[PDB]
Amino acid sequence: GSLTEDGLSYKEKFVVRSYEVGSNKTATVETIANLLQEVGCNHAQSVGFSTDGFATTTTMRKLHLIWVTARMHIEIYKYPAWGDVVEIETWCQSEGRIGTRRDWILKDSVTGEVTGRATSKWVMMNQDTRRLQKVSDDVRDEYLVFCPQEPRLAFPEENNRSLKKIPKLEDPAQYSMIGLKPRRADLDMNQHVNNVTYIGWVLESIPQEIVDTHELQVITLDYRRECQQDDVVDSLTTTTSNDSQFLHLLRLSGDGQEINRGTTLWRKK
Amino acid sequence: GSLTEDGLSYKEKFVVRSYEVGSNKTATVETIANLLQEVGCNHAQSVGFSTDGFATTTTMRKLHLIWVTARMHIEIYKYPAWGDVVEIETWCQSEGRIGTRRDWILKDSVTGEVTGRATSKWVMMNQDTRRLQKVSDDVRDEYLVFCPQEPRLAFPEENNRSLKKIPKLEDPAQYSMIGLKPRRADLDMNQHVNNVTYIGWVLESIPQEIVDTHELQVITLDYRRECQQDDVVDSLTTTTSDSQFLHLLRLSGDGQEINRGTTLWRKK
Numbered sequence: 223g224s225l226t227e228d229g230l231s232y233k234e235k236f237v238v239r240s241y242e243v244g245s246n247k248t249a250t251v252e253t254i255a256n257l258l259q260e261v262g263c264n265h266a267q268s269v270g271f272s273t274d275g276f277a278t279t280t281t282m283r284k285l286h287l288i289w290v291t292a293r294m295h296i297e298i299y300k301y302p303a304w305g306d307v308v309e310i311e312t313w314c315q316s317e318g319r320i321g322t323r324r325d326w327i328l329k330d331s332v333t334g335e336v337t338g339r340a341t342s343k344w345v346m347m348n349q350d351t352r353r354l355q356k357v358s359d360d361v362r363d364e365y366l367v368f369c370p371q372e373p374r375l376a377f378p379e380e381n382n383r384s385l386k387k388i389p390k391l392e393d394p395a396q397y398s399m400i401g402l403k404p405r406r407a408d409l410d411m412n413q414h415v416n417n418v419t420y421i422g423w424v425l426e427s428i429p430q431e432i433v434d435t436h437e438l439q440v441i442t443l444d445y446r447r448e449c450q451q452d453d454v455v456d457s458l459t460t461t462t463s464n465d466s467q468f469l470h471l472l473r474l475s476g477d478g479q480e481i482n483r484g485t486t487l488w489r490k491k
Numbered sequence: 492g493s494l495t496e497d498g499l500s501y502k503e504k505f506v507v508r509s510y511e512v513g514s515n516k517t518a519t520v521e522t523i524a525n526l527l528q529e530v531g532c533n534h535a536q537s538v539g540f541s542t543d544g545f546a547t548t549t550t551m552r553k554l555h556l557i558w559v560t561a562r563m564h565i566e567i568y569k570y571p572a573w574g575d576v577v578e579i580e581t582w583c584q585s586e587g588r589i590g591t592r593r594d595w596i597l598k599d600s601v602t603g604e605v606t607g608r609a610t611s612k613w614v615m616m617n618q619d620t621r622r623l624q625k626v627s628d629d630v631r632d633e634y635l636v637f638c639p640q641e642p643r644l645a646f647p648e649e650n651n652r653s654l655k656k657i658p659k660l661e662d663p664a665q666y667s668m669i670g671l672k673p674r675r676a677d678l679d680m681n682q683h684v685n686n687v688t689y690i691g692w693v694l695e696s697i698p699q700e701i702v703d704t705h706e707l708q709v710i711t712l713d714y715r716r717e718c719q720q721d722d723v724v725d726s727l728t729t730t731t732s733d734s735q736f737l738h739l740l741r742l743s744g745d746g747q748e749i750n751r752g753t754t755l756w757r758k759k
């Protein structure tokens with residue numbers, strides 16, 4: 223991979239692997255989410271930021287400040303087949319004191335057509351107390367020289383799905399997947415559960431028949447709290463709807479403390 | 492990747508990804524196992540065999556015959572760091588009517604030094620009845636033209652770790668990790684649990700302190716039975732000693748054995 227000519231975005235090609243594909247011989251949405259995370263990490267390394275998933279400055283490290291995902295929105299049109307080359311372009315934009323946004327465009331390397339797009343909202347937090355804080359100007363200036371100044375949004379639309387409010391699933395849930403625990407493969411280098419694992423746990427409560435007759439088009443996920451290595455998770459889904467829509471809730475098996483919420487949109491094959 | 496000049500082996504380079512590394516910024520043993528599976532799949536595609544993990548022929552497909560792993564043995568000397576290029580070379584060899592062996596050599600692309608090696612024993616089976624069958628001559632001949640004729644073993648040593656008999660762990664187990672279930676990410680394109688997942692389940696019963704003070708050097712795993720999508724697994728470990736462990740994977744309910752193995756770890 224490499225930063226583009228103007229240095230305000232980063233591009234990378236990936237060949238789809240055998241173990242990365244699902245029952246349709248095409249890459250899974252978790253493989254896509256992993257690839258976005260990989261190109262994001264490579265963009266941060268290419269300009270001097272941390273490579274631990276937090277993309278911090280030396281000023282942030284002294285203060286114990288990190289960047290954490292608040293929302294992740296993905297919309298796939300065509301999942302790449304096993305052996306296909308997929309080119310992903312990524313960039314960041316500051317959204318004031320609220321936080322920053324990382325966007326992605328996925329294209330077919332052969333045809334050049336856009337096969338998917340993603341957007342994620344990030345917020346600054348003290349890694350020890352988990353307390354949020356609005357971005358300081360001294361930190362803001364360190365990122366501005368690496369982001370486009372004019373707005374560049376992967377989801378420009380006036381009323382787009384990436385910014386819609388998500389409600390809390392009401393009990394009883396129509397479907398459920400109980401007792402989900404992370405293993406060592408689900409942890410990152412800092413021993414935290416990888417953001418992608420939560421996407422897999424959300425999709426576990428989708429019935430197999432839906433998976434076999436439909437394809438995932440859109441997924442919007444709000445992150446509220448971390449699941450520790452020694453925590454157990456309950457995944458809850460309810461149909462809200464050709465197209466099929468679901469409301470999702472991830473909560474801790476014990477007390478029922480919310481860790482995630484979202485919506486998925488599927489379409490008939 | 493590509494088959495080598497003589498066409499009797501296949502080589503491929505891989506750059507270590509951010510999500511593929513562990514707590515010490517180097518690729519996990521499951522990332523290595525995934526890479527071996529990827530280069531093996533690419534070797535099968537490059538010469539016309541199936542690409543579903545069974546490396547099957549048109550004669551086998553008509554008969555509903557597949558190749559399944561019986562044993563997997565991996566020895567790593569240096570785990571590649573995040574961003575390193577690792578070159579893996581792989582080849583197959585027939586071991587008579589017992590089965591076929593796939594071997595691997597892992598090297599550092601920069602220095603050329605061998606950083607790891609692996610060997611796996613495969614056996615032929617009817618995919619529907621799970622009954623094993625001795626490989627016929629008509630099937631043997633289809634593979635011979637793609638394997639070296641002289642022996643080429645990643646583990647040549649007489650009396651080596653890859654061919655040692657593994658005993659069954661006695662109850663009670665010193666350590667355990669119970670209620671392990673596979674998710675959709677653990678399934679392959681045929682909806683079977685991926686072979687690598689079993690390696691992760693085996694290592695789940697290793698205490699965190701051992702993981703934090705030691706590095707995995709050797710792992711030998713015998714495959715006995717499949718864990719279905721709707722099955723629950725119990726992982727059992729006991730210290731037999733460097734640190735050595737005896738492992739057992741069994742179904743949470745009846746206690747039916749699905750896997751057994753040994754791991755060897757070294758102080759960092």
Ligand SMILES: O=C(Nc1ccccc1)N1CCCC1
Nearest residue numbers: 265266277289314322344368
């Ligand atoms: O990766 C970045 N920032 C960034 C900005 C420009 C160039 C390279 C990296 N972030 C992820 C968390 C929010 C900030």
Ligand SMILES: O=C(Nc1ccccc1)N1CCCC1
Nearest residue numbers: 290291292417445446447448
């Ligand atoms: O805890 C999180 N985010 C998060 C990110 C990754 C995994 C788990 C949780 N947040 C609280 C304030 C909004 C974001």
Ligand SMILES: O=C(Nc1ccccc1)N1CCCC1
Nearest residue numbers: 534535546558583591613637
């Ligand atoms: O992959 C192979 N065989 C093979 C042999 C030569 C070239 C390409 C593939 N196998 C795995 C199970 C035993 C057979």
Ligand SMILES: O=C(Nc1ccccc1)N1CCCC1
Nearest residue numbers: 559560561686714715716717
């Ligand atoms: O069922 C298997 N092997 C296997 C392979 C992969 C996953 C699970 C099981 N075997 C029957 C006796 C020889 C090996």
